[PDB]
Structure 1
Amino acid sequence: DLADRFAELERRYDARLGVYVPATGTTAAIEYRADERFAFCSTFKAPLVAAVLHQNPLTHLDKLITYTSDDIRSISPVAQQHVQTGMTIGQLCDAAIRYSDGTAANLLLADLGGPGGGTAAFTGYLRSLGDTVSRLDAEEPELNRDPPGDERDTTTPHAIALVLQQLVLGNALPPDKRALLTDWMARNTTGAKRIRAGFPADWKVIDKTGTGDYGRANDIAVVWSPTGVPYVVAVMSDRAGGGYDAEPREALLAEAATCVAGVLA
C-alpha cells in the first residue's frame, strides 16, 4: 500500500524516486526502486570520510594539506577560504560532510591515493564493506552530471543504505573513529528540507545530502525513534527526463520521508 503513495509522488513531481529502509527486527524493509541505479552526487562523501578514517591512525587528522586556486573547481564553502593557510585532513572531513565541500572531497580522494585520483581506491572500500554494486569514476564536479542511463558514478538505495548501516550502526569503524563520523553527520548544514523535514522534531536525524544535474536530489540518513530505535533511510531521486537543466525538488524527498515515518511509528 506504500508503493502507491511513492508512485503518486513520482507523477506529482515529474521525477523518479528511489527509497530503501533496511529491515530492523520488529519491522520489515521498505523498498521502492530499491535496486534501480541513482547517481551518487555528493552523498559519496559520507563513506569517503569513513574510508580515510579507516586507513589511518587518528593522529593523521592533524596532517596539513595545501592546495592552489586551480584545485577549486566546484562549490567549496570552506576550501575557498584557506587557499594559502591550507587545512588539515580533519577539517577536510568536517567540510566534506558538514558543508558538502566539493574541493575537500577531492583532496580526501587524493589522500586515499591510487589510480583515477583515488576513485578506484574508494570503490575498493565499498567492496570491502560488502557493497558489490556502487562505483565512483570521476571527481567533483563531473560525478554529478553523467548522462541518464550511464552506470558511471552510481549506487542503489539498497546498497547505499547498507553501507551507511554498517558505518554508524555497525562495526565497520572502531568506536572512536565512528563517533567522529557520526557527530559530523549530526551537525550537517545541508539537509534541513529533506529527510529532516519529513520527520517529527523528536526524531533525531543525522544525514548527508547529494545534489547534481538532471534534477538529481538525494538524502541518505540515520534516524532515531523518540524511544531510541535507529532506522536507516535512503531516499534518492532524479528528473533526468527534463534535461540537464532540470531543477531538483527537495519537497519530494521530505514528503517521501513523511510516508516512511508514519510507517515506522
Structure 2
Amino acid sequence: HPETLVKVKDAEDQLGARVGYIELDLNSGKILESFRPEERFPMMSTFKVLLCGAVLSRVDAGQEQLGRRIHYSQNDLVEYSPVTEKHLTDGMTVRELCSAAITMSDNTAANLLLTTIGGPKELTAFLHNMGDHVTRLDRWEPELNEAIPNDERDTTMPAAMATTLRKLLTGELLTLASRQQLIDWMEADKVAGPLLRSALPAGWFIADKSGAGERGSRGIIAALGPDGKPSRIVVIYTTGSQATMDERNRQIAEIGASLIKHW
C-alpha cells in the first residue's frame, strides 16, 4: 500500500540515508511494493540464512549431515560468539551451528559453516547457480560488516534478496524437509524483537533474520502472514545513516506497522 512508501520516504528523511524496501507475494513472487529495489546494501547477518540454505542443499545431496559434529578451538572464536563460546569444550553439530547462526547471529557459528561449504566464494557460487547474480559474500565474520560506502563486497539488492529468499523457502531448490528446517530456524529467531515482530498481531506467523553493521547499516528479511501462515516476503535495508540503533530500529518498525496495517 502506498501509505507504506510514505513511511519509507519518511524513514530516509529521518535517518538521512537510503532505505531499500521490498514486499513480495509469497505465492506468485510478484512485487507488491518496492523502493530502491536495485540499490546495493550490506547484507550483515541476514546472509546467515543464505549460508544455511547452501548448507541444507548439501545435506539434501547427502554431502553433509545435520548431526556431523565440528570440533573447533580458541583460534576460531571471533567477536560475538555467545553459543559457540559456551560449547567450546563440547563442540557443536552442523544443525546446532545453523540454529546458532540464524537464531542468535553467532559469528563464529557462521564462519564454521562457511568453512564446511568452502568459504565466501562458494556461497556466492551457490547463489549464482540458483539464479542470483547480484548477491555476493566476500569476507568472513566480522569483517563482512564493514559497510564501506560504495563497496560492493558482501552486499545484495532488496529485489535479489527477496527473490532468493522466496526460492530457498518455496522453490524446489531444497527438499520440503530442508525448506521446513530453514523456515523453522528463522521462525525461532530470537534477536530481532525490536523490528517487524514488534508490530506483529497475535496469531500471525513470522520467520525472519535481522542484521546490523557499521555506518548505521541495518536490515531484516522476512516471511510473514496472518493466521499462522506466511503469504509475503519482506526485505528492508538501510545504510549510511548516523542515527542511533534505537532510531533505526524505530523507523524499521514503523515501516512494519504500516505494512501490517494495510495488509
Could you state the TM-score of these two structures normalised by the residue count of structure 2?
0.91
Q: CA deviation at 1:212?
A: 0.9
In 1, Cα distance between the equivalents of 2:260 and 2:190? 22
Q: CA deviation at 1:53?
A: 1.0
- The C-alpha deviation readout for 1:40-80, integer Å capped at 9, x for no partner, is 10000001001011012397111111111121112011001
Residue 254 of structure 2 aligns with which residue? 255
Alignment of 1:37-48 (within 5 A): 37-48=40-51
Contact 1:168 1:182 in 2 (8 A): yes
Contact 1:214 1:247 in 2 (8 A): no
Greater alpha carbon shift after TM alignment, 192-201 vs 174-183: 192-201
Could you state the TM-score of these two structures normalised by the residue count of structure 1?
0.90
**CA distance change for structure 1 residues 252 and 42 in 2, over 3 Å: closer, same or farther?**
same
Q: CA deviation at 1:25?
A: 5.2
Contact 2:7 2:254 in 1 (8 A): no
Residue 234 of structure 2 aligns with which residue? 233
In 2, Cα distance between the equivalents of 1:192 and 1:219? 11
Alignment of 1:88-167 (within 5 A): 88-113=93-118, 118-167=119-168
Q: CA deviation at 1:119?
A: 0.4
Give the alignment partner of residue 34 of structure 1, picking from 37, 43, 51.
37
Are 2:80 and 1:81 equivalent residues in the alignment? no
Contact 2:220 2:235 in 1 (8 A): yes
Greater alpha carbon shift after TM alignment, 5-14 vs 174-183: 5-14
Residue identity in the other structure for 1:63: R
Are 2:198 and 1:197 equivalent residues in the alignment? yes
Report the aligned-residue RMSD.
Answer: 2.0
**Unpaired runs of at least 5, structure 2:** none
> Secondary structure of 2:65's partner?
helix
Q: CA deviation at 1:133?
A: 0.5
Residue identity in the other structure for 1:14: G
Contact 1:51 1:122 in 2 (8 A): yes
In 1, Cα distance between the equivalents of 2:35 and 2:209? 20
In 1, Cα distance between the equivalents of 2:228 and 2:72? 45
- The C-alpha deviation readout for 1:164-196, integer Å capped at 9, x for no partner, is 111123322101111111111111101111111
In 2, Cα distance between the equivalents of 1:226 and 1:11? 34
In the comparison of the two structures, how many residue pairs are matched? 256
Give the alignment partner of residue 68 of structure 1, picking from 64, 73, 76.
73
Percent of residue pairs identical: 36
Residue identity in the other structure for 1:220: I
Residue 57 of structure 2 aligns with which residue? 54
Greater alpha carbon shift after TM alignment, 199-208 vs 118-127: 199-208
Q: CA deviation at 1:213?
A: 0.9
Higher relative contact order (CA 8 A, sep 6+): 2
Q: CA deviation at 1:97?
A: 0.8
Contact 1:198 1:256 in 2 (8 A): no
**CA distance change for structure 1 residues 120 and 70 in 2, over 3 Å: closer, same or farther?**
same
Contact 2:147 2:213 in 1 (8 A): no
Q: CA deviation at 1:8?
A: 1.6
**Unpaired runs of at least 5, structure 1:** none
Alignment of 1:164-243 (within 5 A): 164-226=165-227, 228=229, 230-238=231-239, 240-242=240-242
Contact 1:79 1:103 in 2 (8 A): yes
